[PDB]
């Protein structure tokens, strides 16, 4: 039921206007019958994940672009896709009337929407907060006696997450990251700027900080929320730079290694939270593989690290083979996970461009590239923001897939949302990326995966302005003849048996 209500704001494409009584949604999912395929299409001209189906052909009579599926070339398994429940996202969602709130959550979490199964949760404040605070703001409180959650957790974030879980049919995984420690644990005594933990790994500052993870997890467990994973620190490299404008805590790779080895790993291992995974890095991929070499060749640290979390500034450009590829080569049993991505912030261009096709294309290009270099999940940044791209106490505004307009009790679904949906909606946890080869150089971006039930899903992004005719071959079934219109993204699904 219910198509997108489009509105142009002068940019390349439209947004979809949602309010208290109306929001675009999908019908509950059917699967195509064996011998047919399903196609979801989004265009810069305005199609929004439209469902169509076609026949799978037995024969293909040469000789244009062919993408061959390689079912037996088996790669990484997928953890999931989601975004971040920041103070700012929660604050915006809740500023809406209760019914508009539900249509917004259903868009991300339910099967009537794009079926996210990951939520990233800051541990205390970040730049997407309207005040700086930690859970332990009493100075020198080493025992953590005045550890508590503020209203941001108890009245905003946690009630929202619960509502997300009730809406979702997929199991949802929670991921936690700290931006800063209490200031009394830090060399510079401030939430921002250059500074790291006082003293050295093994000592009372480091033990206290490690205990602060356990106290956080207990506080959330009391509200009936259990975490899948935590990261060692959000963007540890940030806290090494003088003048770093917002919450941060500096770790060189050697500091992070020793911190995990001496403190964070054992503290977590000897707690009721021993099943929580620990991810290292949580920072720009350009720090790989070096960061991974320092930490993971230390067996005392490696025994506790489940994975490597990476960030990207979406405005800026790769190679990825030299980072993600090499990291995987070196540590094939250590999963890579994209924990944050956002589109800026060009300068030049506004923080929020309502309707930007380019920004959407930047998301799917990124997800595809990540998928092709072994990455197992992709977590977007703020779930929702206002039209200024905030609130953000440091004015570090960015874009988000859903923009809330509180004065009108409406929200807008950006192209980013749909570009994300082409992946989150159809690649459940346990899907496995398989091989896909091109018959000739082309302008498309594609990735192929196997759904845990054996069915296929292939995403095809066309960043050129020209329609590109293509066929996909899957030896088990035959041929999918199709066209990828210029400036479009399609997801193709079909049974193999």
Ligand X SMILES: OCCN1C[C@H](O)[C@@H](O)[C@H](O)[C@@H](O)C1
Ligand Y SMILES: *[C@@H]1O[C@H](CO)[C@@H](O)[C@H](O)[C@H]1NC(C)=O
Interface region with ligand Y, contact rule CB under 6 A, candidates 18-26, 73-81, 291-299, 475-483: 18-26
Interface region with ligand Y, contact rule CB under 6 A, candidates 17-25, 93-101, 144-152, 195-203: 17-25
Q: Which does 348 bind (CB under 5 to 8 A by kind): its own copies, ligand X, ligand Y, none?
A: its own copies
Q: How far is the CB of 5 from ligand Y (least distance, A)?
A: 4
Catalytic residue among 235, 300, 349, 481: 235
**Does residue 342 contact residue 399 with C-beta atoms inside 8 Å?**
yes
Active-site annotation holds for 254: no
Q: Which residues, 238 to 277, sit near its own copies by CB under 8 A?
A: 241-245
Based on the shown chain and the rule CB under 6 A, indicate whether residue 22 belongs to the binding site for ligand Y.
yes
The residue among 45, 63, 51, 64 whose CA lies nearest residue 24 is 51
Based on the shown chain and the rule CB under 6 A, indicate whether residue 406 belongs to the binding site for ligand Y.
no
Q: Which does 398 bind (CB under 5 to 8 A by kind): ligand X, ligand Y, its own copies, none?
A: ligand X
Q: How far is the CB of 341 from ligand X (least distance, A)?
A: 6
Give the footprint of ligand X on this chain (CB under 6 A). 126-128, 234-235, 311-313, 340-342, 381, 396, 398
Q: Tell me the angle at which helices 98-109 and 87-94 cross, rounded to the nearest 10 degrees.
A: 130
Q: Which does 126 bind (CB under 5 to 8 A by kind): its own copies, ligand X, ligand Y, none?
A: ligand X
Strands 307-313 and 335-342: parallel
Residue nearer to its own copies on the CB measure, 278 or 320? 320
Strands 50-55 and 375-382: unpaired
Residue nearer to its own copies on the CB measure, 283 or 474? 283
Based on the shown chain and the rule CB under 8 A, indicate whether residue 343 belongs to the binding site for its own copies.
no
Based on the shown chain and the rule CB under 8 A, indicate whether residue 2 belongs to the binding site for its own copies.
no
**Does residue 291 contact residue 254 with C-beta atoms inside 8 Å?**
no
Give 243's Cβ-side CA count (13 Å radius).
Answer: 0
Interface region with its own copies, contact rule CB under 8 A, candidates 61-69, 237-245, 399-407, 448-456: 237-245
Whole-Å CA distances, 443 to 19, 164, 421, 449, 486: 38, 38, 22, 20, 10
What is the residue-wise DSSP string for 208-232? HHHHHHHHHHHHHHHTT---SEEES
Interface region with its own copies, contact rule CB under 8 A, candidates 59-67, 112-120, 314-322, 469-477: 314-322
Q: How far is the CB of 18 from ligand Y (least distance, A)?
A: 7
Based on the shown chain and the rule CB under 8 A, indicate whether residue 322 belongs to the binding site for its own copies.
yes
Residue nearer to ligand Y on the CB measure, 22 or 479? 22
Strands 173-178 and 229-231: parallel
Q: How far is the CB of 263 from its own copies (least distance, A)?
A: 25
Residue 82 pairs in a beta bridge with: 118, 379
Residue nearest to ligand X (CB): 311
The strands making up 488-494's β-sheet, listed across from edge to edge, are 50-55, 36-43, 488-494, 456-462, 444-450, 432-438, 66-77, 468-474, 478-484
Active-site annotation holds for 340: yes
Catalytic residue among 112, 152, 233, 340: 340
Peptide bond into 289 cis (omega under 30): yes
**Does residue 100 contact residue 22 with C-beta atoms inside 8 Å?**
no
User: Which member of 21, 59, 407, 440 binds ligand Y (CB under 6 A)?
Assistant: 21
Q: First and final CA of the chain: distance in angstroms? A: 29
Residue nearer to ligand X on the CB measure, 341 or 436? 341
Based on the shown chain and the rule CB under 8 A, indicate whether residue 286 belongs to the binding site for its own copies.
yes
- The DSSP call for residue 115 is -
Whole-angstrom Cα distance, residue 360 to residue 365?
9
Based on the shown chain and the rule CB under 6 A, indicate whether residue 184 belongs to the binding site for ligand Y.
no
User: Which member of 58, 316, 440, 441 binds its own copies (CB under 8 A)?
Assistant: 316
Q: How far is the CB of 413 from ligand Y (least distance, A)?
A: 13
Sign of the alpha-carbon dihedral angle for 233, 238, 243, 246: negative
Interface region with ligand Y, contact rule CB under 6 A, candidates 16-24, 77-85, 135-143, 364-372: 16-24
Structural tokens at position 417:
């949302």
**Does residue 189 contact residue 258 with C-beta atoms inside 8 Å?**
no
Structural tokens at position 191:
């939430």
Binding interface with ligand Y (CB under 6 A): 5, 19, 21-22
Catalytic residues: 235, 340
């Amino acid at each position: 039921a219910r198509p997108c209500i489009p509105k142009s704001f002068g940019y390349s494409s439209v947004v979809c206007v949602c309010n208290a009584t109306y929001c675009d949604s999908f019908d509950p999912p059917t699967f195509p019958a064996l011998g047919t395929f399903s196609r979801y299409e989004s265009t810069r001209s305005g199609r929004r994940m439209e469902l169509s189906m076609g026949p799978i052909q037995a024969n293909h009579t040469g000789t244009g672009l062919l993408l061959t599926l390689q079912p037996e070339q088996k790669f990484q398994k997928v953890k999931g896709f989601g975004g971040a429940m920041t103070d700012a996202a929660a604050l915006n969602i809740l500023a809406l009337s209760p019914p508009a709130q539900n249509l917004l959550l259903k868009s991300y979490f339910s099967e009537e929407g794009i079926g996210y199964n990951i939520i990233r949760v800051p541990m205390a404040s970040c730049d997407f907060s309207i005040r700086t605070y930690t859970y332990a703001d009493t100075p020198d409180d080493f025992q953590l006696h005045n550890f508590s959650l503020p209203e941001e957790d108890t009245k905003l974030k946690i009630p929202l997450i619960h509502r997300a879980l009730q809406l979702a049919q997929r199991p949802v995984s929670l991921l936690a990251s700290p931006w800063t420690s209490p200031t009394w644990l830090k060399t510079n005594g401030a939430v921002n700027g250059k500074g790291s933990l006082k003293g050295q790994p093994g000592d009372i500052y480091h033990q206290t900080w490690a205990r602060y993870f356990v106290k956080f997890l207990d506080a959330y467990a009391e509200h009936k929320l259990q975490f899948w994973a935590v990261t060692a620190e959000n963007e540890p490299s940030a806290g090494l730079l003088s003048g770093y404008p917002f919450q941060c805590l500096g770790f060189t790779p050697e500091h992070q290694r020793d911190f995990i080895a001496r403190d964070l790993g054992p503290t977590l291992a000897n707690s009721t939270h021993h099943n929580v995974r620990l991810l290292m890095l949580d920072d720009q991929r350009l720090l790989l593989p070096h960061w991974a070499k320092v930490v993971l060749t230390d067996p005392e640290a490696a025994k506790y690290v489940h994975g490597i979390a990476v960030h990207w500034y979406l405005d800026f450009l790769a190679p990825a083979k030299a980072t993600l590829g090499e990291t995987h080569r070196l540590f094939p049993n250590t999963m890579l996970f994209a924990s944050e991505a956002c589109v800026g912030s060009k300068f030049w261009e506004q923080s929020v461009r309502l309707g930007s096709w380019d920004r959407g294309m930047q998301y799917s290009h990124s997800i595809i590239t990540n998928l092709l270099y072994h990455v197992v999940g992709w977590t977007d940044w703020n779930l929702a923001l206002n039209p200024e791209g905030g609130p953000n106490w440091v004015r570090n505004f960015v874009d988000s897939p859903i923009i809330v307009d509180i004065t009108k009790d409406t929200f807008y679904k950006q192209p980013m949302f749909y570009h994300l949906g082409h992946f989150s909606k159809f690649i459940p946890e346990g899907s496995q990326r398989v091989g896909l080869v091109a018959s000739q150089k082309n302008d498309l971006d594609a990735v192929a995966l196997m759904h845990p039930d054996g069915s296929a899903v292939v995403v095809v992004l066309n960043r050129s302005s020209k329609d590109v005719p293509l066929t996909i071959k899957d030896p088990a079934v035959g041929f999918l003849e199709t066209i990828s219109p210029g400036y479009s993204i399609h997801t193709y699904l079909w049974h193999r048996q």
